[PDB]
Structure formats: C-alpha cells, structure tokens
Amino acid sequence: PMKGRFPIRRTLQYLSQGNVVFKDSVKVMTVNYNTHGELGEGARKFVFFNIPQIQYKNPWVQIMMFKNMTPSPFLRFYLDSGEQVLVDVETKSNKEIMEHIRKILGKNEETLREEEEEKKQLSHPANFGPRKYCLRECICEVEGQVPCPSLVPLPKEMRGKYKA
Amino acid sequence: ATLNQMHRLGPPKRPPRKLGPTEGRPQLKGVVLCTFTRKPKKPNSANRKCCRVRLSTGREAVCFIPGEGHTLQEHQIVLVEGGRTQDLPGVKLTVVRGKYDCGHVQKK
RNA sequence: AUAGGUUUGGUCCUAGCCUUUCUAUUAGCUCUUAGUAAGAUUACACAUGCAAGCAUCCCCGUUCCAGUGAGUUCACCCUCUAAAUCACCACGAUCAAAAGGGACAAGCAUCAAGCACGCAGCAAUGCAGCUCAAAACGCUUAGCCUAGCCACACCCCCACGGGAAACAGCAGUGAUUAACCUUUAGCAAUAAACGAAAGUUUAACUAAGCUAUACUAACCCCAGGGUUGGUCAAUUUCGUGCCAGCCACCGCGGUCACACGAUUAACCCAAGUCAAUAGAAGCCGGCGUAAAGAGUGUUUUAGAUCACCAAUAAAGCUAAAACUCACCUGAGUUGUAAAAAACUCCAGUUGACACAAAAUAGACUACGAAAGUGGCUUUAACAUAUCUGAACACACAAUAGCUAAGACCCAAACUGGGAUUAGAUACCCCACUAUGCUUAGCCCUAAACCUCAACAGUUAAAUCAACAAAACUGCUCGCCAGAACACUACGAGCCACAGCUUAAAACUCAAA
RNA sequence: ACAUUUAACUAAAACCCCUACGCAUUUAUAUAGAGGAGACAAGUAAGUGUACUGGAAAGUGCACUUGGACG
Ligand code: FES
Ligand SMILES: [K+]
Ligand SMILES: [K+]
Ligand SMILES: [K+]
Ligand SMILES: [K+]
Ligand SMILES: [K+]
Ligand SMILES: [K+]
Ligand SMILES: [K+]
Ligand SMILES: [Mg+2]
Ligand SMILES: [Mg+2]
Ligand SMILES: [Mg+2]
Ligand SMILES: [Mg+2]
Ligand SMILES: [Mg+2]
Ligand SMILES: [Mg+2]
Ligand SMILES: [Mg+2]
Ligand SMILES: [Mg+2]
Ligand SMILES: [Mg+2]
Ligand SMILES: [Mg+2]
Ligand SMILES: [Mg+2]
Ligand SMILES: [Mg+2]
Ligand SMILES: [Mg+2]
Ligand SMILES: [Mg+2]
Ligand SMILES: [Mg+2]
Ligand SMILES: [Mg+2]
Ligand SMILES: [Mg+2]
Ligand SMILES: [Mg+2]
Ligand SMILES: [Mg+2]
Ligand SMILES: [Mg+2]
Ligand SMILES: [Mg+2]
Ligand SMILES: [Mg+2]
Ligand SMILES: [Mg+2]
Ligand SMILES: [Mg+2]
Ligand SMILES: [Mg+2]
Ligand SMILES: [Mg+2]
Ligand SMILES: [Mg+2]
C-alpha cells in the first residue's frame, strides 16, 4: 500500500479540497507550534493536515514552520504593505483555525466565482483551432456546411483539377 | 525505502538500451569476405551455412544464410537483418534472401 | 495487464528472458479505383533555371516569407524602458528590444571540491570573503514546454579580418544511407512588399504531378501475405533421416516428422501481409537463507513524534607446571600401533628458580559500542533525562602481517633428520626458526554472525509460502533491483607497494 | 598604446591605434609487445581471514564460525 500514516493527504483530491485562497496581500505565513502539550493539539493537526492544502492553493506564499520556540502556538501572516497579522491558535481545533484564517485573509466565494467567469471568457466557443484550445478545428465540422474533402469528396465542379 | 529517501534519490534512472549488431537499424548493407560453415552447439548437429561480411559501418561480422542452397561468393553485396541464430553462438545477423546478389531459394 | 510460456525427479518462493496489444521506418512478396493527409538518410558537394520588387527620380522593401536541427537552459513571469503602429498636439494604449530579479532538459559523484568564484565605502581604500553531497566545478547526450517557440544561415562561436567561393528557398543532381516526389502552372483566392490609386511582383501560397506511408469510400471481372507442436486460431499425403533444414521462448529432425522441403486442407488479416529495427507500457517492492542491515560508536545540516560479577588503562605481586643450576643415587632416557632417529653435559628424589600462561570456581551468563574480557592488590574509570543520524568526517577494531629494540619456558608456519609409500615437497617421531610475549609505531582484514539495522509500540487479526528465530505496526538511516564477467579492470584515497576501501563496462546465457 | 584642427555675410568640412598561437594545452586514433574474461570443446568434517612452502595440484601454522559428528 501507500507509505506513511494518512496517505490520503498525498492525493491531488485531498490537496485540492482546501478552501483557503489567500488574498494577494499575504506573502509569508509562519507557523509556530509545539510538538507536545494538549493545548496545542489542533495546531499540530493544522500542521499535519491543512498546511499541504494551503500551500497547494497558494503556491507563491512562503510557508515556514517553527517548533518549540514559544510556550504557545500562533500563526503570523506578513502582508505586502508591511502589516503583520497575529492569530492565537491555542485551544483551537484545526478546523477552527482554517475557518478563522479563511474569514480574516481568505478570498470570499464571490471573488473566486468572478475569477472563474473571467477565465471562462478566454476560451471563446466560437473560435476555431486545435483541440487543445478550441472546441472545433474547422467549420466543416458544423452540420449543414460543406464537409471535409477527406471524408466526403467534393463535386467535380468545385475542384480546381476539373475547373482548369 | 522511506519517502524521504525516495525524494532524495528521485525517479528511477533507466540505463540506455543496448544497441544490437545492427546498431539500432533495420538492415545493413555488407560485402561478403568469405563463406564457410559452422557447427551447432550440441543438443543439435548440422553444418550451418555462414559468411563473414564487412558491413557499411566498417565492422566485420558473421552472418547466417537461411534457406536451402546459396550462391554467395566473395566481393558480393548482401543485405543483413537482425535476429539471432539460436543454434550458433555469436551469430546475431541474418542475410536477407532476394536482395542484391543473394537470390531467393530455388523451388524444391 | 484479466495475463501467459520458460529453471526442478517433484512442490513452493524469488528472479530474469520471451509471448499476446498499438504505432513509425525499412526489407521480402503482392497490389484495382476515387478523395484527403504526409513525404532525402546526410549542417556532405552542387551543373542548370527561377525564388524581390515597387515607384514621377527621393525613399521604402529585399532584416519579411521560405529552409534546416549543427549548436544549445537567449524562449516563460515581473521591473524598467528603446525602436514600431495608432492617437500622431500629447495624455496614453498596443507591441516589443537592451538592462535588472525569478524560473527553466537528460545521464555520469569512478566529475568532490571550484580557485577569486564576495562584501563594505563618494572615492581613497578596508575586510577575506563567495559556490558546493539539498550536487558547485566538470564530461557526455539532446532542438524544445509544438495555435507555436529557440538556434543557425559554408567554415573560423562572432565576422573588422581570414579560409574560400557556399541550394539547411523551389525544382533538380552527384556521392552517401536500410532510407530515394515533378528541373508543373498561376498570381484567380489569402498573405507579404510598394504605390494616393487603378494596380505590379512573389517557387509564400493556390491548383496540379509522383509515392500503399496513413485515413475515408468503393469495386463490373479481379487476392495476396503469413501461419497451422505448446504459449496461440488452424495439416492430409509423400520426400529426407541429427543430413537437408526450422524456431519469438520452450524446442523439432536418428524410417509412423501434425515442428524441415513439396503437396492437400485449414486458420488470421487483407490491398495488403509482417521479417528486422525503434518506440509506446515499470520500482509506494524488498534486505536471516534467493540481490540487499555494508565489524563498532558519536555527531553535523536536518528529519521523526517514540520528547556488585570476566569493561578499559596503569603500576606492583604469585599459587601450580616448566626451563636452568647443585648434591645424592642409577645406566640408560626419549620416542609408539610398531620402529628408527635423538640424547646419554641422560634419567629419579630433594632444594633454589620467569618480561611465558593464568586448574578448580564456571552446571555461572556477567562487563564492554564492537573487537574482546575469567590469577591477586591498589589508583583512575565505564558519554547523553527525546529518538534517528556517515564506505569517506572523528574515534576504535580478533587472528595473521610489516618496521625498530628487548625477553624466550612452551608451542610452532618454514627448514632439516627418522619412518611409511609406487612416489610423500603431507599425515606419525625428533630438533629448530619467523611468529605467539613487552615497549614505540604501522597495517585495517574475518563465518568481525544472534547470518535478526536503531528507537517506539501491539498480541488483535487469515498467525503463517518454506525453513530458521511466534506474527506484526509506526518512524528513521543504510542498502538492493537476472546470472557471470567481478572480493575483477580503470579512476581516486590511504604509513599500506604481490596491500586495503570504493567499484564498472564489453563479449556470453536463459537461466542463476 | 593614443589625441581638436579648419571654419563661421545661410553653415559646414575634416576623423580610421598596435598586439596572440606556442618545444603551450585537451581529448582521441594507429601501431611493437604483454595479459585477461567469455564461447566452443571435452584417517585427517566443512568453511572465513591472514601468512609461509610449492611450478602447480595442494599442505601446514594462528584466531574465528556451525552453515558438521558426539547413541
Ligand atoms: S479540417 Fe475542415 S475541411 Fe478539412
Ligand atoms: K537434436
Ligand atoms: K517605393
Ligand atoms: K539540433
Ligand atoms: K555559427
Ligand atoms: K494573388
Ligand atoms: K515419412
Ligand atoms: K556464528
Ligand atoms: Mg516469470
Ligand atoms: Mg523442466
Ligand atoms: Mg511492404
Ligand atoms: Mg517610441
Ligand atoms: Mg530582454
Ligand atoms: Mg555519494
Ligand atoms: Mg572508472
Ligand atoms: Mg544534435
Ligand atoms: Mg550547403
Ligand atoms: Mg557564422
Ligand atoms: Mg532543394
Ligand atoms: Mg521513405
Ligand atoms: Mg512562375
Ligand atoms: Mg499537393
Ligand atoms: Mg511444415
Ligand atoms: Mg545473499
Ligand atoms: Mg550486522
Ligand atoms: Mg546518535
Ligand atoms: Mg553515504
Ligand atoms: Mg588490529
Ligand atoms: Mg605482532
Ligand atoms: Mg566474534
Ligand atoms: Mg544505524
Ligand atoms: Mg549506516
Ligand atoms: Mg547482476
Ligand atoms: Mg582490488
Ligand atoms: Mg588456511
């Protein structure tokens, strides 16, 4: 089988399941957490389960971890303006931490739908080209139009060989 | 191996495929230097018709002449393909019948 | 992979090789029509004809299109900002150079160190720094990430200059390779150049020619190729007799050959068929006995969640048994299955007497990281309150071996003598060396093995290929991907020089 | 290494440097000779490491292992 505990974490479905897409202001995310102590339990789970998802949805944000440097766990976000956001996560579950960071620094669903609609415009259904970019290659694929000579030979009157 | 070791080593690096007597080419042209016969390794017994040929690449190689009866002489041009002669050790090339000087086997 | 054949007298396991599928090139044999797509092996040399004009002179264009794949992280993102188009009054958009930042192919670590690769200051100058096992530096391979992009335009990277006289534009040719399209037409369409424009030019392009390379559709008469022992669909007669010959693997052929040749019949595909070549498709599996835990411990950058007895160094010391010496006694002692050699300065008792070795305890199972450690006393003394962490770093490592000196009872490679034997350059007996011992340096190998890597955890599941030693889980480091070549060659390092560590490739095989 | 002239009732003319490449350096090919691997072809238990003897085959010495035997 797949190596390691919780191998589901190393699948693209789980990595894409995350719901935190940071705003463009965020640049760096530091995670100070303690390897032992019940009050930090969620933080440990936050490191174990949700940091891969956050990084997957935010490839350009520098995520860094620190261990047993402070008595309590906390998150710090550095923004492009120079402002710093401190989030205390002691006594909080990993789901609670995800919800909090999504609320304070995550793009709302409206912006994500707007971005998706913007992406939609790039692929114009009327454009003709290779299948990598367009639904159809040629107008001959449209019913009622003159079909490709490869599949249906054109009438002799429409061919230069018998027009010359 | 652990995940860290697998990440360190990276994807398996497959050695490059070994080139055969034809050096990755379907056929090769050659000039016959001498014709002779060789004996099989022994679960079997026969006199297998063979010929030494200088290939277009310049290398000299031993080739087997399939079929009953050949008329190959020195200085003649032949086309040789791949395929080992299972009975003859070291003979990995076969002469193509019906090409250049080497003609087709006479009927019966 | 829905897998299958093949190791053995036989079973299971492990492991390679091959078969079945789909493409492309070439070769053999065969080949009817129509449409469409695609189309030198060669960055080798090129005869010949064309491939750039336009335009009231200036300019503009010929820097484009078209070609090739030699070289090769100039292609992508951001910042800044030239040239160009349009605003052209610029405000600015579009497009996109140079410069700055980031990203960016494959194999080899037997390429492990690069050798100035940095920083600070207005400068003067100062500091000694910078890259690198998370792969620098280096060698080799390759056009790439294909609405396309990058690089080159005969060669010297470049092209002032030199070699020298250039088709990697179209058509075409010579040589070369297994690889082989016409020395057609027109600017009617689109694109580009020019013009104010009617328009002109264009081997771009369009329309044609050749070619089963591919797809699509047909066909009035017209079918070929391969195969028929198993894998794998399908053989009747003869001929031959381990010969001729055949096979992808296993294999067949010695007078009844479904395996060779002919012939009959059958099977698959079909204007094709399939012989060769090259691709398409791979390690989340393992390491006691099949390849793999590499003699032992520590730590770095990091990763993980498990946060008293037999140690070793010194100093001293000695209870048995030897050797040597002395008295007394005897003529023999030693050797063994038996003898011969050897000794007779021999042998027995008694007494004195080690730089060798350490009965009994030990039927104990302890100490030490391992190697190892078992006579007595004394002094030092056996790391770490997370774990893992190196062929190479730092320390160690039985026996054997090499240098120097010393000690020498006993044992003993080697070397002699006696005996045996067809022979004895061995076994048996005698003698004696290197060596076993101490001191100061080396050498760095073992079936260095509990043939079980270190820490943490479980005894629930079908316990579980087999055997060994009940079966597993988490985490980490090391190692392994058919056999042999090969404890090898070369390279590198080493106090080693017939040495040790690391460690391949070619040829060969279907197994091991 | 190396250097600012004419001209100027509208404005122009003039402009040009010398050095490398070797008895250096890298890799590769051919060649005398030597040596390997593969194919064809035909009583003393067993081992590991190391050492000596021997032309070899092998023997012996020291330590270690059971992957031997001891009813
Ligand atoms: S592809 Fe459209 S006519 Fe052929
Ligand atoms: K046979
Ligand atoms: K013009
Ligand atoms: K290229
Ligand atoms: K060039
Ligand atoms: K035109
Ligand atoms: K017969
Ligand atoms: K052992
Ligand atoms: Mg198999
Ligand atoms: Mg068998
Ligand atoms: Mg063909
Ligand atoms: Mg401008
Ligand atoms: Mg640029
Ligand atoms: Mg290494
Ligand atoms: Mg080497
Ligand atoms: Mg190339
Ligand atoms: Mg040319
Ligand atoms: Mg040039
Ligand atoms: Mg041409
Ligand atoms: Mg062709
Ligand atoms: Mg013309
Ligand atoms: Mg055409
Ligand atoms: Mg037959
Ligand atoms: Mg083994
Ligand atoms: Mg071990
Ligand atoms: Mg440790
Ligand atoms: Mg290593
Ligand atoms: Mg030693
Ligand atoms: Mg010694
Ligand atoms: Mg031991
Ligand atoms: Mg370890
Ligand atoms: Mg290790
Ligand atoms: Mg192997
Ligand atoms: Mg060696
Ligand atoms: Mg020995």
Side-chain angles (χ1 to χ4, degrees), chain B residues 6-101:
Chain B
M6 289 163 86
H7 170 67
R8 259 196 85 207
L9 294 174
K13 303 184 199 173
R14 269 68 198 283
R17 281 75 178 272
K18 289 188 59 51
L19 293 173
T22 60
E23 289 134 15
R25 296 165 72 171
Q27 301 97 16
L28 269 168
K29 187 173 73 174
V31 188
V32 185
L33 305 162
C34 66
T35 51
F36 55 93
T37 63
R38 267 182 190 195
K39 292 177 71 68
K41 70 187 313 180
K42 275 190 172 292
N44 294 336
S45 49
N47 286 284
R48 305 265 181 252
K49 277 70 177 175
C50 292
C51 63
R52 188 177 278 274
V53 298
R54 185 177 65 246
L55 306 165
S56 66
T57 61
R59 164 168 91 81
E60 274 185 20
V62 177
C63 295
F64 174 65
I65 302 165
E68 291 164 344
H70 74 84
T71 54
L72 287 190
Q73 293 179 356
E74 183 178 1
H75 304 313
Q76 292 208 304
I77 316 297
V78 291
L79 193 73
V80 297
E81 60 180 357
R84 64 180 289 231
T85 313
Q86 293 92 334
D87 291 331
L88 299 169
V91 182
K92 299 184 289 295
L93 289 175
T94 304
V95 182
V96 178
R97 285 286 207 163
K99 191 62 174 195
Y100 303 130
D101 286 282

Side-chain angles (χ1 to χ4, degrees), chain A residues 12-26:
Chain A
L12 288 180
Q13 188 274 331
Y14 182 90
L15 288 178
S16 79
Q17 184 178 2
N19 55 350
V20 180
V21 182
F22 285 127
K23 296 180 176 69
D24 300 315
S25 55
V26 184

Side-chain angles (χ1 to χ4, degrees), chain A residues 34-47:
Chain A
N34 297 330
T35 52
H36 288 93
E38 53 264 49
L39 292 191
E41 180 67 75
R44 279 190 299 277
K45 295 182 187 293
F46 176 76
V47 168

Side-chain angles (χ1 to χ4, degrees), chain A:
Chain A
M2 293 177 71
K3 294 164 177 300
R5 280 181 311 125
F6 294 95
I8 191 72
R9 297 176 301 143
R10 294 162 39 232
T11 68
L12 288 180
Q13 188 274 331
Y14 182 90
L15 288 178
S16 79
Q17 184 178 2
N19 55 350
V20 180
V21 182
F22 285 127
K23 296 180 176 69
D24 300 315
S25 55
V26 184
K27 301 291 182 179
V28 182
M29 183 177 176
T30 63
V31 181
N32 280 69
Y33 75 105
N34 297 330
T35 52
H36 288 93
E38 53 264 49
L39 292 191
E41 180 67 75
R44 279 190 299 277
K45 295 182 187 293
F46 176 76
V47 168
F48 191 83
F49 285 109
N50 309 123
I51 292 297
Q53 294 173 317
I54 289 158
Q55 193 69 90
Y56 192 83
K57 297 291 180 69
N58 305 280
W60 312 133
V61 170
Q62 191 215 333
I63 301 174
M64 203 150 162
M65 283 73 74
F66 302 101
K67 296 173 74 172
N68 308 305
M69 293 195 43
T70 57
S72 59
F74 62 90
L75 309 182
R76 188 135 53 178
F77 303 87
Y78 299 81
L79 311 185
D80 198 45
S81 54
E83 191 190 336
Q84 297 173 13
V85 192
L86 183 65
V87 183
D88 175 12
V89 298
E90 204 174 45
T91 72
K92 280 193 180 232
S93 87
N94 64 303
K95 186 180 289 293
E96 282 159 44
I97 298 161
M98 294 299 291
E99 284 153 353
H100 184 104
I101 64 184
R102 183 178 182 270
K103 185 175 180 178
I104 64 169
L105 280 166
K107 291 181 182 180
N108 59 4
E109 293 179 353
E110 293 83 3
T111 316
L112 298 175
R113 292 189 296 272
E114 196 170 308
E115 277 146 4
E116 182 65 26
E117 293 178 354
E118 191 276 331
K119 300 294 187 291
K120 182 175 73 175
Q121 184 178 2
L122 299 172
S123 314
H124 204 311
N127 288 5
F128 293 94
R131 200 54 52 93
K132 200 193 146 181
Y133 310 97
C134 302
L135 301 167
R136 297 161 294 192
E137 298 255 354
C138 201
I139 197 70
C140 72
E141 291 157 46
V142 181
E143 60 200 294
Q145 312 292 113
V146 176
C148 197
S150 174
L151 298 172
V152 187
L154 295 171
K156 266 178 154 211
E157 304 89 47
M158 275 163 104
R159 299 169 43 201
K161 176 154 150 208
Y162 299 87
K163 290 185 286 186

